[PDB]
């Protein structure tokens, strides 16, 4: 569904246990009500809430898990440009 750009400013704001957003690829996700059900545990998401998790997410998930677990309403929309360096997760 053809959806609106979201700014990095707004994303960075969503970064706590009960208001958690993430940027995978260049897209935005509200992972808040998903938390309790993450087979990878809550912490990993919490620890990285409000960040770009592309480099961690992508090597641990096949491209077809997002649509199995996550309601499309929670696929928030595409990122406007890019997350600031400080808020992009790198491989460990």
């Amino acid at each position: 569904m053809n959806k609106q750009k979201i700014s990095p400013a707004e994303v960075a704001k969503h970064n706590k246990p009960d208001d958690c957003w993430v940027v995978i690829n260049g897209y935005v996700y509200d992972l808040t009500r998903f938390l309790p059900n993450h087979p990878g545990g809550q912490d990993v998401i919490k620890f990285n809430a409000g960040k770009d998790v592309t480099a961690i997410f992508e090597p641990l998930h096949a491209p077809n898990v997002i649509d199995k677990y996550i309601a499309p309403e929670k696929k928030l929309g595409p990122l406007q440009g890019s997350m600031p360096p400080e808020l992009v997760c790198p491989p460990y």
Partner: antibody
Amino acid sequence: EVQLQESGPSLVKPSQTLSLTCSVTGDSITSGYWNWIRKFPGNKLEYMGYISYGGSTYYNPSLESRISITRDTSKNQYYLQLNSVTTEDTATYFCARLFGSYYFDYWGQGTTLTVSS
Amino acid sequence: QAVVTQESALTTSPGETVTLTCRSSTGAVTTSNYANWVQEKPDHLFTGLIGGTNKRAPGVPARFSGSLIGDKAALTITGAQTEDEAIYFCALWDSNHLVFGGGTKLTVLG
């Protein structure tokens, strides 16, 4: 340095149930996505499906009714089951791993399977 | 279910740069398709080359690169070698299903 070896029959009559093994030595199958690929006689490759390092499955929507991928971490192997076999299933079967979302690292040698009465 | 289409065959000679491309039937390929490329040499030999559009697999010669050219994924071989003579398969993640095309036969004039 990391080997995938496929096992199974070389021949099976149509109607039967084919059973394939992939033995993995050099790395734990609890790490990447573990998959099945077919190479038909005409050069066409077909992605069969996968099992995760957690046991989660996915199957080609054309094979859901037949295919079944299992795994046993103890022996460090996974499996492919494909019943209601048909002439069309004649091909060479490969297991390969997928650095989830990225590239294929590690393919097996493959085993040829023939379906014939 | 998208159909992934790629060149019948391509001929080239050592040293030259060659590009192989990969089209999905439903629309333009973006990085969300996580384009993937594998090579098949004679004797059932398969090697993973590219993943996530432009990520080189380990052990893969730097002459191999992937990119997004127009509306399709692209495999670039910069300075092709005679041993690069083999069949190249493209794969796209479309509609939560991973789909191979019919592959390209790349001849590298030896």
